[PDB]
Symmetry: C2
Subunit: 291 residues, 2 copies
Protein backbone atom coordinates (compact mmCIF):
# COMPACT_ATOMS: atom_id res chain seq x y z
CA UNK A 1 0.00 0.00 0.00
CA UNK A 2 0.99 3.66 -0.41
CA UNK A 3 0.54 6.05 2.47
CA UNK A 4 1.17 9.77 2.15
CA UNK A 5 0.96 10.35 5.91
CA UNK A 6 4.10 8.27 6.29
CA UNK A 7 6.18 10.00 3.64
CA UNK A 8 7.91 13.04 5.29
CA UNK A 9 8.22 14.74 1.86
CA UNK A 10 4.39 14.86 1.65
CA UNK A 11 4.14 16.55 5.06
CA UNK A 12 5.62 19.91 4.00
CA UNK A 13 3.28 22.92 4.08
CA UNK A 14 4.05 23.44 0.39
CA UNK A 15 2.39 20.12 -0.53
CA UNK A 16 -1.27 20.66 -1.45
CA UNK A 17 -3.44 17.70 -2.45
CA UNK A 18 -7.14 17.91 -3.17
CA UNK A 19 -7.61 14.11 -3.23
CA UNK A 20 -5.05 12.06 -1.22
CA UNK A 21 -6.87 8.70 -1.63
CA UNK A 22 -6.76 9.14 -5.43
CA UNK A 23 -3.03 10.10 -5.25
CA UNK A 24 -2.27 7.00 -3.17
CA UNK A 25 -4.01 4.69 -5.64
CA UNK A 26 -2.11 6.25 -8.60
CA UNK A 27 1.23 5.96 -6.74
CA UNK A 28 0.30 2.37 -5.97
CA UNK A 29 -0.11 1.73 -9.75
CA UNK A 30 3.29 3.31 -10.40
CA UNK A 31 4.88 1.07 -7.69
CA UNK A 32 3.34 -2.15 -9.13
CA UNK A 33 4.59 -1.34 -12.67
CA UNK A 34 8.17 -0.56 -11.55
CA UNK A 35 10.88 0.65 -13.93
CA UNK A 36 9.58 -1.31 -16.98
CA UNK A 37 6.34 0.69 -17.25
CA UNK A 38 7.46 4.19 -16.26
CA UNK A 39 8.16 7.30 -18.31
CA UNK A 40 8.54 10.95 -17.35
CA UNK A 41 7.07 13.91 -19.14
CA UNK A 42 8.20 17.28 -17.89
CA UNK A 43 8.35 20.99 -18.49
CA UNK A 44 11.73 22.66 -17.87
CA UNK A 45 11.56 26.37 -16.93
CA UNK A 46 10.29 26.85 -13.33
CA UNK A 47 9.64 23.10 -13.16
CA UNK A 48 13.13 21.55 -13.29
CA UNK A 49 14.76 24.99 -12.90
CA UNK A 50 14.15 27.26 -9.85
CA UNK A 51 11.73 30.19 -9.85
CA UNK A 52 13.80 31.93 -7.10
CA UNK A 53 17.09 31.80 -5.07
CA UNK A 54 18.65 34.03 -2.28
CA UNK A 55 15.50 36.25 -2.39
CA UNK A 56 16.28 36.54 -6.06
CA UNK A 57 14.38 35.67 -9.16
CA UNK A 58 15.95 32.98 -11.39
CA UNK A 59 16.21 33.13 -15.22
CA UNK A 60 14.19 31.14 -17.76
CA UNK A 61 16.22 29.90 -20.79
CA UNK A 62 14.96 32.94 -22.69
CA UNK A 63 16.21 35.20 -19.82
CA UNK A 64 19.67 33.66 -20.01
CA UNK A 65 19.94 35.19 -23.52
CA UNK A 66 17.89 38.35 -22.67
CA UNK A 67 20.45 39.13 -19.90
CA UNK A 68 23.78 38.26 -21.47
CA UNK A 69 26.76 40.31 -22.58
CA UNK A 70 25.77 39.80 -26.28
CA UNK A 71 22.51 41.81 -25.89
CA UNK A 72 22.06 45.64 -25.58
CA UNK A 73 20.32 47.39 -22.63
CA UNK A 74 17.97 48.74 -25.30
CA UNK A 75 17.12 45.28 -26.56
CA UNK A 76 16.34 44.21 -22.95
CA UNK A 77 14.09 47.26 -22.69
CA UNK A 78 12.06 46.25 -25.76
CA UNK A 79 11.95 42.68 -24.46
CA UNK A 80 10.66 43.92 -21.06
CA UNK A 81 8.06 46.06 -22.89
CA UNK A 82 6.88 42.97 -24.85
CA UNK A 83 6.66 40.95 -21.61
CA UNK A 84 4.51 43.60 -19.93
CA UNK A 85 1.97 43.85 -22.81
CA UNK A 86 1.76 40.13 -23.61
CA UNK A 87 1.96 38.78 -20.04
CA UNK A 88 -1.13 40.84 -19.16
CA UNK A 89 -2.87 38.80 -21.86
CA UNK A 90 -1.42 35.49 -20.70
CA UNK A 91 -2.83 36.20 -17.24
CA UNK A 92 -6.11 37.86 -18.33
CA UNK A 93 -8.98 36.07 -16.58
CA UNK A 94 -11.56 37.13 -19.27
CA UNK A 95 -10.11 35.67 -22.51
CA UNK A 96 -10.39 31.92 -23.10
CA UNK A 97 -7.22 29.87 -23.58
CA UNK A 98 -7.99 29.61 -27.33
CA UNK A 99 -8.32 33.40 -27.71
CA UNK A 100 -4.80 33.78 -26.19
CA UNK A 101 -3.16 31.54 -28.80
CA UNK A 102 -2.68 34.28 -31.41
CA UNK A 103 -1.21 36.64 -28.74
CA UNK A 104 1.33 33.94 -27.54
CA UNK A 105 2.48 33.27 -31.07
CA UNK A 106 3.18 37.01 -31.52
CA UNK A 107 5.02 37.31 -28.22
CA UNK A 108 7.55 34.51 -28.92
CA UNK A 109 7.81 35.74 -32.58
CA UNK A 110 8.48 39.37 -31.59
CA UNK A 111 10.90 38.47 -28.80
CA UNK A 112 12.76 35.77 -30.80
CA UNK A 113 13.08 38.32 -33.62
CA UNK A 114 14.70 40.77 -31.26
CA UNK A 115 17.26 38.17 -30.19
CA UNK A 116 17.92 37.16 -33.83
CA UNK A 117 18.81 40.83 -34.33
CA UNK A 118 21.41 40.80 -31.51
CA UNK A 119 23.70 38.33 -33.41
CA UNK A 120 24.00 35.25 -31.21
CA UNK A 121 26.69 32.69 -32.07
CA UNK A 122 26.33 29.02 -31.24
CA UNK A 123 29.97 29.03 -29.99
CA UNK A 124 29.26 31.52 -27.20
CA UNK A 125 26.25 29.61 -25.61
CA UNK A 126 28.55 27.60 -23.32
CA UNK A 127 30.10 30.86 -21.91
CA UNK A 128 26.72 32.61 -21.64
CA UNK A 129 25.18 29.63 -19.80
CA UNK A 130 28.29 29.28 -17.53
CA UNK A 131 28.05 32.87 -16.30
CA UNK A 132 24.25 32.95 -16.04
CA UNK A 133 22.32 32.70 -12.74
CA UNK A 134 20.43 29.54 -13.76
CA UNK A 135 19.60 27.14 -10.96
CA UNK A 136 18.17 23.63 -11.07
CA UNK A 137 15.74 22.62 -8.34
CA UNK A 138 17.19 21.04 -5.24
CA UNK A 139 17.51 17.28 -5.69
CA UNK A 140 18.04 17.36 -9.51
CA UNK A 141 21.18 15.15 -9.42
CA UNK A 142 19.12 12.46 -7.70
CA UNK A 143 16.16 13.02 -9.98
CA UNK A 144 18.19 12.61 -13.19
CA UNK A 145 20.51 9.98 -11.62
CA UNK A 146 17.83 7.53 -10.48
CA UNK A 147 16.13 7.82 -13.84
CA UNK A 148 19.33 7.22 -15.87
CA UNK A 149 20.21 4.34 -13.50
CA UNK A 150 16.90 2.57 -14.33
CA UNK A 151 16.88 3.81 -17.97
CA UNK A 152 13.54 5.64 -17.46
CA UNK A 153 12.52 7.73 -20.55
CA UNK A 154 12.39 11.45 -19.80
CA UNK A 155 10.73 13.71 -22.29
CA UNK A 156 11.50 17.36 -21.53
CA UNK A 157 8.87 19.39 -23.35
CA UNK A 158 9.66 23.07 -23.21
CA UNK A 159 8.43 26.33 -24.66
CA UNK A 160 11.91 27.78 -23.86
CA UNK A 161 15.04 27.75 -26.10
CA UNK A 162 16.30 24.25 -26.74
CA UNK A 163 19.99 25.04 -27.25
CA UNK A 164 20.03 26.89 -23.91
CA UNK A 165 18.13 24.19 -22.05
CA UNK A 166 20.48 21.50 -23.32
CA UNK A 167 23.57 23.60 -22.38
CA UNK A 168 22.19 24.10 -18.79
CA UNK A 169 21.68 20.33 -18.33
CA UNK A 170 24.93 19.39 -20.00
CA UNK A 171 26.97 21.73 -17.73
CA UNK A 172 25.03 20.34 -14.73
CA UNK A 173 26.10 16.79 -15.80
CA UNK A 174 22.54 15.47 -16.00
CA UNK A 175 21.96 15.34 -19.80
CA UNK A 176 21.96 11.53 -19.96
CA UNK A 177 20.92 9.25 -22.87
CA UNK A 178 17.42 8.74 -21.34
CA UNK A 179 16.61 12.50 -21.68
CA UNK A 180 14.93 13.64 -24.89
CA UNK A 181 14.54 17.42 -25.36
CA UNK A 182 11.66 18.82 -27.46
CA UNK A 183 11.82 22.64 -27.55
CA UNK A 184 12.24 25.75 -29.71
CA UNK A 185 15.66 25.12 -31.28
CA UNK A 186 17.73 27.84 -32.89
CA UNK A 187 18.54 27.82 -36.55
CA UNK A 188 22.06 28.99 -37.37
CA UNK A 189 23.53 30.42 -40.59
CA UNK A 190 26.80 29.61 -42.46
CA UNK A 191 28.86 31.33 -39.67
CA UNK A 192 27.06 29.64 -36.74
CA UNK A 193 25.08 32.81 -35.89
CA UNK A 194 21.38 32.61 -34.86
CA UNK A 195 19.10 33.47 -37.85
CA UNK A 196 15.72 31.94 -36.87
CA UNK A 197 14.03 29.04 -35.07
CA UNK A 198 13.38 25.47 -36.22
CA UNK A 199 10.05 23.69 -36.73
CA UNK A 200 6.74 24.86 -35.26
CA UNK A 201 6.59 27.21 -32.32
CA UNK A 202 6.04 25.59 -28.92
CA UNK A 203 4.41 28.01 -26.46
CA UNK A 204 2.48 27.70 -23.19
CA UNK A 205 -0.92 26.85 -24.77
CA UNK A 206 -0.17 24.52 -27.69
CA UNK A 207 1.59 21.59 -26.05
CA UNK A 208 -1.21 19.32 -27.24
CA UNK A 209 0.01 20.00 -30.80
CA UNK A 210 3.64 19.14 -30.05
CA UNK A 211 2.64 16.13 -27.98
CA UNK A 212 0.77 14.61 -31.01
CA UNK A 213 3.60 15.57 -33.43
CA UNK A 214 5.88 13.22 -31.37
CA UNK A 215 4.03 9.95 -32.07
CA UNK A 216 7.37 8.55 -33.25
CA UNK A 217 8.91 8.83 -29.72
CA UNK A 218 5.74 7.71 -27.86
CA UNK A 219 5.01 4.67 -30.08
CA UNK A 220 8.52 3.31 -29.28
CA UNK A 221 7.48 3.43 -25.60
CA UNK A 222 4.17 1.58 -25.91
CA UNK A 223 4.82 -0.43 -22.76
CA UNK A 224 5.66 2.63 -20.60
CA UNK A 225 2.03 3.13 -19.67
CA UNK A 226 2.77 4.66 -16.23
CA UNK A 227 3.49 8.36 -16.48
CA UNK A 228 4.67 11.03 -14.13
CA UNK A 229 4.00 14.48 -15.52
CA UNK A 230 5.56 17.69 -14.06
CA UNK A 231 4.68 21.25 -15.00
CA UNK A 232 4.09 24.76 -13.74
CA UNK A 233 1.10 25.81 -15.89
CA UNK A 234 -2.37 24.67 -16.88
CA UNK A 235 -0.91 24.23 -20.42
CA UNK A 236 1.55 21.62 -19.22
CA UNK A 237 -1.38 19.25 -18.47
CA UNK A 238 -1.54 18.55 -22.25
CA UNK A 239 2.04 17.26 -22.45
CA UNK A 240 0.88 13.61 -22.15
CA UNK A 241 -1.71 13.84 -25.01
CA UNK A 242 0.44 11.75 -27.42
CA UNK A 243 1.06 8.77 -25.14
CA UNK A 244 0.21 5.42 -26.76
CA UNK A 245 -1.69 3.94 -23.75
CA UNK A 246 -2.20 5.21 -20.20
CA UNK A 247 -2.56 2.90 -17.21
CA UNK A 248 -1.56 5.32 -14.42
CA UNK A 249 -0.66 8.96 -14.73
CA UNK A 250 0.40 11.27 -11.85
CA UNK A 251 0.41 15.00 -12.47
CA UNK A 252 2.50 17.25 -10.22
CA UNK A 253 2.30 21.01 -10.59
CA UNK A 254 4.56 23.78 -9.34
CA UNK A 255 2.56 26.79 -8.36
CA UNK A 256 5.34 29.39 -8.19
CA UNK A 257 3.30 32.54 -8.54
CA UNK A 258 -0.21 33.98 -8.47
CA UNK A 259 -0.81 31.64 -5.54
CA UNK A 260 -4.15 32.91 -4.16
CA UNK A 261 -5.61 33.39 -7.65
CA UNK A 262 -4.58 29.97 -9.08
CA UNK A 263 -4.50 27.54 -6.10
CA UNK A 264 -8.08 26.23 -6.48
CA UNK A 265 -7.56 25.70 -10.22
CA UNK A 266 -4.24 23.92 -9.70
CA UNK A 267 -5.69 21.72 -6.95
CA UNK A 268 -8.61 20.75 -9.18
CA UNK A 269 -6.42 19.98 -12.17
CA UNK A 270 -3.05 18.70 -10.88
CA UNK A 271 -2.99 15.69 -8.51
CA UNK A 272 -0.25 17.21 -6.37
CA UNK A 273 0.32 20.96 -6.18
CA UNK A 274 3.68 22.21 -4.89
CA UNK A 275 3.36 25.75 -3.60
CA UNK A 276 6.47 28.00 -3.86
CA UNK A 277 8.68 24.90 -3.69
CA UNK A 278 12.28 24.85 -5.02
CA UNK A 279 13.09 21.15 -4.76
CA UNK A 280 12.35 17.81 -6.52
CA UNK A 281 12.01 15.82 -3.25
CA UNK A 282 8.32 14.86 -3.52
CA UNK A 283 8.93 13.45 -7.04
CA UNK A 284 12.25 11.85 -5.88
CA UNK A 285 10.37 10.13 -3.05
CA UNK A 286 7.77 8.70 -5.46
CA UNK A 287 10.70 7.44 -7.57
CA UNK A 288 12.34 5.83 -4.51
CA UNK A 289 9.23 3.71 -3.87
CA UNK A 290 8.77 2.96 -7.61
CA UNK A 291 12.20 2.16 -9.03
CA UNK B 1 49.73 22.82 -38.69
CA UNK B 2 49.73 19.28 -37.19
CA UNK B 3 53.04 17.53 -36.18
CA UNK B 4 52.70 13.90 -35.01
CA UNK B 5 56.35 14.00 -33.95
CA UNK B 6 55.41 16.60 -31.32
CA UNK B 7 52.45 14.65 -29.88
CA UNK B 8 53.76 12.19 -27.18
CA UNK B 9 50.72 9.91 -27.57
CA UNK B 10 51.82 9.22 -31.17
CA UNK B 11 55.32 8.24 -30.04
CA UNK B 12 54.28 4.98 -28.36
CA UNK B 13 55.58 1.75 -29.92
CA UNK B 14 51.98 0.60 -30.27
CA UNK B 15 51.16 3.42 -32.74
CA UNK B 16 51.69 2.22 -36.31
CA UNK B 17 51.03 4.57 -39.20
CA UNK B 18 51.69 3.76 -42.85
CA UNK B 19 51.28 7.35 -44.05
CA UNK B 20 51.94 10.08 -41.43
CA UNK B 21 51.75 13.00 -43.91
CA UNK B 22 48.21 11.95 -44.87
CA UNK B 23 47.24 11.50 -41.18
CA UNK B 24 48.56 15.00 -40.43
CA UNK B 25 46.49 16.54 -43.23
CA UNK B 26 43.30 14.70 -42.09
CA UNK B 27 43.87 15.84 -38.47
CA UNK B 28 44.38 19.33 -39.82
CA UNK B 29 40.93 19.17 -41.50
CA UNK B 30 39.43 18.00 -38.22
CA UNK B 31 41.08 20.90 -36.34
CA UNK B 32 39.78 23.49 -38.86
CA UNK B 33 36.20 22.17 -38.61
CA UNK B 34 36.20 22.17 -34.78
CA UNK B 35 33.20 20.87 -32.81
CA UNK B 36 30.49 22.03 -35.30
CA UNK B 37 31.64 19.63 -38.02
CA UNK B 38 32.66 16.57 -35.96
CA UNK B 39 30.93 13.25 -35.36
CA UNK B 40 32.22 9.95 -33.99
CA UNK B 41 31.47 6.49 -35.35
CA UNK B 42 32.71 3.59 -33.27
CA UNK B 43 32.60 -0.11 -32.57
CA UNK B 44 32.23 -1.12 -28.90
CA UNK B 45 33.73 -4.54 -28.09
CA UNK B 46 37.54 -4.51 -27.98
CA UNK B 47 37.40 -0.94 -29.31
CA UNK B 48 35.90 1.04 -26.37
CA UNK B 49 36.16 -1.99 -24.10
CA UNK B 50 39.50 -3.71 -23.31
CA UNK B 51 40.73 -6.88 -24.98
CA UNK B 52 42.81 -7.74 -21.85
CA UNK B 53 43.69 -6.73 -18.25
CA UNK B 54 45.98 -8.11 -15.42
CA UNK B 55 47.24 -10.73 -17.95
CA UNK B 56 43.60 -11.64 -18.28
CA UNK B 57 41.24 -11.69 -21.18
CA UNK B 58 38.27 -9.27 -20.97
CA UNK B 59 34.64 -10.15 -21.88
CA UNK B 60 32.70 -8.96 -24.94
CA UNK B 61 29.03 -8.11 -24.24
CA UNK B 62 28.07 -11.58 -25.40
CA UNK B 63 30.63 -13.05 -22.91
CA UNK B 64 29.07 -11.13 -20.04
CA UNK B 65 25.93 -13.32 -20.55
CA UNK B 66 27.85 -16.48 -21.58
CA UNK B 67 29.73 -16.24 -18.25
CA UNK B 68 26.99 -15.04 -15.86
CA UNK B 69 25.28 -17.03 -13.09
CA UNK B 70 22.01 -17.39 -15.13
CA UNK B 71 23.74 -19.59 -17.72
CA UNK B 72 24.93 -23.17 -17.20
CA UNK B 73 28.33 -24.94 -17.57
CA UNK B 74 26.75 -27.09 -20.27
CA UNK B 75 25.43 -24.10 -22.17
CA UNK B 76 28.97 -22.67 -22.01
CA UNK B 77 30.38 -25.92 -23.44
CA UNK B 78 28.07 -25.61 -26.47
CA UNK B 79 28.81 -21.90 -26.88
CA UNK B 80 32.57 -22.66 -26.76
CA UNK B 81 32.10 -25.38 -29.38
CA UNK B 82 30.24 -22.87 -31.62
CA UNK B 83 33.08 -20.29 -31.17
CA UNK B 84 35.63 -22.97 -32.20
CA UNK B 85 33.92 -23.94 -35.44
CA UNK B 86 32.67 -20.55 -36.63
CA UNK B 87 35.73 -18.55 -35.53
CA UNK B 88 37.90 -20.82 -37.76
CA UNK B 89 35.69 -19.67 -40.67
CA UNK B 90 35.84 -16.00 -39.55
CA UNK B 91 39.65 -16.20 -39.63
CA UNK B 92 39.97 -18.45 -42.73
CA UNK B 93 42.28 -16.68 -45.15
CA UNK B 94 40.91 -18.61 -48.18
CA UNK B 95 37.17 -17.69 -48.13
CA UNK B 96 36.18 -14.20 -49.28
CA UNK B 97 34.37 -11.84 -46.91
CA UNK B 98 31.12 -12.44 -48.88
CA UNK B 99 31.38 -16.22 -48.54
CA UNK B 100 31.65 -15.85 -44.71
CA UNK B 101 28.38 -13.91 -44.41
CA UNK B 102 26.14 -17.00 -44.25
CA UNK B 103 28.43 -18.53 -41.57
CA UNK B 104 28.33 -15.36 -39.35
CA UNK B 105 24.56 -15.30 -39.55
CA UNK B 106 24.50 -18.96 -38.38
CA UNK B 107 26.93 -18.30 -35.52
CA UNK B 108 25.01 -15.35 -33.97
CA UNK B 109 21.69 -17.22 -34.60
CA UNK B 110 22.87 -20.45 -32.95
CA UNK B 111 24.56 -18.72 -30.01
CA UNK B 112 21.70 -16.22 -29.37
CA UNK B 113 19.30 -19.19 -29.51
CA UNK B 114 21.30 -20.92 -26.81
CA UNK B 115 21.00 -17.86 -24.59
CA UNK B 116 17.26 -17.47 -25.25
CA UNK B 117 17.02 -21.04 -23.89
CA UNK B 118 18.71 -20.03 -20.62
CA UNK B 119 15.85 -17.70 -19.52
CA UNK B 120 17.43 -14.25 -19.20
CA UNK B 121 15.35 -11.58 -17.48
CA UNK B 122 15.74 -7.89 -18.26
CA UNK B 123 15.67 -7.14 -14.50
CA UNK B 124 18.84 -9.10 -13.82
CA UNK B 125 21.08 -7.36 -16.44
CA UNK B 126 22.16 -4.69 -13.97
CA UNK B 127 23.40 -7.32 -11.46
CA UNK B 128 25.04 -9.43 -14.19
CA UNK B 129 26.86 -6.41 -15.66
CA UNK B 130 27.90 -5.23 -12.13
CA UNK B 131 29.62 -8.51 -11.27
CA UNK B 132 31.13 -9.06 -14.73
CA UNK B 133 34.80 -8.35 -15.52
CA UNK B 134 34.07 -5.78 -18.20
CA UNK B 135 36.62 -3.02 -18.54
CA UNK B 136 36.53 0.18 -20.58
CA UNK B 137 39.76 1.33 -22.25
CA UNK B 138 41.92 3.66 -20.23
CA UNK B 139 40.88 7.26 -20.77
CA UNK B 140 37.18 6.55 -21.52
CA UNK B 141 35.87 9.10 -18.99
CA UNK B 142 37.81 11.80 -20.85
CA UNK B 143 36.79 10.40 -24.22
CA UNK B 144 33.03 10.42 -23.44
CA UNK B 145 33.31 13.60 -21.30
CA UNK B 146 34.96 15.86 -23.90
CA UNK B 147 32.47 14.66 -26.45
CA UNK B 148 29.43 15.35 -24.21
CA UNK B 149 30.93 18.73 -23.24
CA UNK B 150 31.01 19.82 -26.89
CA UNK B 151 27.81 17.93 -27.86
CA UNK B 152 29.66 15.74 -30.40
CA UNK B 153 27.50 12.96 -31.93
CA UNK B 154 28.71 9.48 -31.11
CA UNK B 155 27.25 6.57 -32.98
CA UNK B 156 28.22 3.29 -31.31
CA UNK B 157 27.63 0.57 -33.89
CA UNK B 158 28.07 -2.86 -32.39
CA UNK B 159 27.57 -6.46 -33.41
CA UNK B 160 27.33 -7.23 -29.62
CA UNK B 161 24.15 -7.22 -27.42
CA UNK B 162 22.72 -3.73 -27.10
CA UNK B 163 21.07 -4.12 -23.67
CA UNK B 164 24.40 -5.28 -22.26
CA UNK B 165 26.45 -2.55 -23.97
CA UNK B 166 24.03 0.09 -22.70
CA UNK B 167 24.19 -1.27 -19.12
CA UNK B 168 28.06 -1.22 -19.20
CA UNK B 169 28.11 2.45 -20.31
CA UNK B 170 25.36 3.53 -17.95
CA UNK B 171 27.09 1.96 -14.86
CA UNK B 172 30.34 3.59 -16.01
CA UNK B 173 28.50 6.98 -16.01
CA UNK B 174 29.34 7.72 -19.65
CA UNK B 175 25.98 7.02 -21.42
CA UNK B 176 25.35 10.69 -22.19
CA UNK B 177 22.66 12.17 -24.51
CA UNK B 178 25.20 12.50 -27.37
CA UNK B 179 25.64 8.69 -27.55
CA UNK B 180 23.38 6.68 -29.88
CA UNK B 181 23.63 2.88 -29.63
CA UNK B 182 22.81 0.72 -32.72
CA UNK B 183 23.23 -2.97 -31.86
CA UNK B 184 21.49 -6.34 -31.49
CA UNK B 185 18.76 -5.55 -28.98
CA UNK B 186 16.96 -8.21 -26.98
CA UNK B 187 13.26 -8.80 -27.38
CA UNK B 188 11.49 -9.65 -24.12
CA UNK B 189 8.21 -11.46 -23.49
CA UNK B 190 5.29 -10.55 -21.20
CA UNK B 191 7.33 -11.49 -18.09
CA UNK B 192 10.41 -9.47 -19.13
CA UNK B 193 12.36 -12.62 -20.11
CA UNK B 194 14.53 -12.73 -23.29
CA UNK B 195 12.67 -14.49 -26.17
CA UNK B 196 14.57 -13.28 -29.28
CA UNK B 197 16.35 -10.32 -30.88
CA UNK B 198 15.01 -7.20 -32.56
CA UNK B 199 15.43 -6.03 -36.15
CA UNK B 200 18.07 -7.34 -38.57
CA UNK B 201 21.18 -9.04 -37.30
CA UNK B 202 24.31 -6.88 -37.10
CA UNK B 203 27.46 -9.01 -37.36
CA UNK B 204 31.12 -8.31 -38.20
CA UNK B 205 30.70 -8.29 -42.03
CA UNK B 206 27.43 -6.49 -42.72
CA UNK B 207 27.96 -3.08 -41.11
CA UNK B 208 27.44 -1.47 -44.53
CA UNK B 209 23.82 -2.67 -44.35
CA UNK B 210 23.13 -1.15 -40.91
CA UNK B 211 25.01 2.06 -41.75
CA UNK B 212 22.65 2.65 -44.77
CA UNK B 213 19.56 1.62 -42.71
CA UNK B 214 20.39 4.58 -40.36
CA UNK B 215 19.96 7.37 -42.92
CA UNK B 216 17.48 9.03 -40.53
CA UNK B 217 20.26 9.62 -37.93
CA UNK B 218 22.93 10.65 -40.52
CA UNK B 219 20.71 13.06 -42.50
CA UNK B 220 20.08 15.04 -39.26
CA UNK B 221 23.88 15.45 -38.98
CA UNK B 222 24.49 16.72 -42.52
CA UNK B 223 26.90 19.38 -41.35
CA UNK B 224 29.00 16.93 -39.29
CA UNK B 225 31.16 16.16 -42.33
CA UNK B 226 34.32 15.43 -40.27
CA UNK B 227 34.38 11.89 -38.94
CA UNK B 228 36.54 9.94 -36.59
CA UNK B 229 35.94 6.22 -37.00
CA UNK B 230 37.19 3.60 -34.45
CA UNK B 231 37.12 -0.14 -34.82
CA UNK B 232 38.95 -3.43 -34.31
CA UNK B 233 38.12 -5.24 -37.57
CA UNK B 234 38.23 -4.83 -41.34
CA UNK B 235 34.39 -4.93 -41.12
CA UNK B 236 34.27 -1.76 -39.01
CA UNK B 237 35.67 0.23 -41.97
CA UNK B 238 32.10 0.19 -43.43
CA UNK B 239 30.51 1.90 -40.42
CA UNK B 240 30.69 5.34 -42.11
CA UNK B 241 28.95 4.23 -45.39
CA UNK B 242 25.70 6.04 -44.48
CA UNK B 243 27.18 9.48 -43.76
CA UNK B 244 25.53 12.31 -45.74
CA UNK B 245 28.78 14.06 -46.90
CA UNK B 246 32.40 13.42 -46.01
CA UNK B 247 34.98 16.21 -45.84
CA UNK B 248 37.59 14.56 -43.56
CA UNK B 249 37.51 11.08 -42.11
CA UNK B 250 40.16 9.51 -39.82
CA UNK B 251 40.04 5.79 -39.27
CA UNK B 252 41.76 4.38 -36.20
CA UNK B 253 42.00 0.60 -35.76
CA UNK B 254 42.77 -1.53 -32.72
CA UNK B 255 44.77 -4.56 -33.72
CA UNK B 256 44.34 -6.66 -30.55
CA UNK B 257 45.15 -10.04 -31.95
CA UNK B 258 46.63 -11.96 -34.88
CA UNK B 259 49.21 -9.14 -35.02
CA UNK B 260 51.80 -10.58 -37.45
CA UNK B 261 49.11 -11.94 -39.78
CA UNK B 262 46.98 -8.76 -39.93
CA UNK B 263 49.41 -5.81 -39.44
CA UNK B 264 50.11 -5.09 -43.13
CA UNK B 265 46.37 -5.25 -43.89
CA UNK B 266 45.47 -2.98 -40.99
CA UNK B 267 48.22 -0.53 -41.93
CA UNK B 268 47.00 -0.37 -45.54
CA UNK B 269 43.32 0.18 -44.58
CA UNK B 270 43.20 2.06 -41.26
CA UNK B 271 45.01 5.44 -41.09
CA UNK B 272 46.28 4.79 -37.56
CA UNK B 273 46.75 1.26 -36.24
CA UNK B 274 46.96 0.73 -32.46
CA UNK B 275 48.78 -2.48 -31.66
CA UNK B 276 47.83 -4.31 -28.43
CA UNK B 277 46.81 -0.96 -26.91
CA UNK B 278 44.34 -0.64 -24.01
CA UNK B 279 43.76 3.10 -23.86
CA UNK B 280 41.97 5.91 -25.74
CA UNK B 281 44.82 8.44 -25.45
CA UNK B 282 45.71 8.75 -29.14
CA UNK B 283 42.03 9.54 -29.97
CA UNK B 284 41.72 11.77 -26.85
CA UNK B 285 44.78 13.74 -28.00
CA UNK B 286 43.23 14.32 -31.44
CA UNK B 287 40.09 15.52 -29.65
CA UNK B 288 42.17 17.91 -27.50
CA UNK B 289 43.50 19.66 -30.60
CA UNK B 290 40.08 19.58 -32.31
CA UNK B 291 37.48 20.56 -29.74
Amino acid sequence: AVHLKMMPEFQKSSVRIKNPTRVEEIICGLIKGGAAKLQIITDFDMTLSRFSYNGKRCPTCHNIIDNCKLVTDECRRKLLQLKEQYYAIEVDPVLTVEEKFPYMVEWYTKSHGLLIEQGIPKAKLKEIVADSDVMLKEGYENFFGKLQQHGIPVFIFSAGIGDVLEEVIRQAGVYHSNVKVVSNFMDFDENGVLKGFKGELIHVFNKHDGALKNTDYFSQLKDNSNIILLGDSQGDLRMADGVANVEHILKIGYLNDRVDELLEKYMDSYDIVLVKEESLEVVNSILQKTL
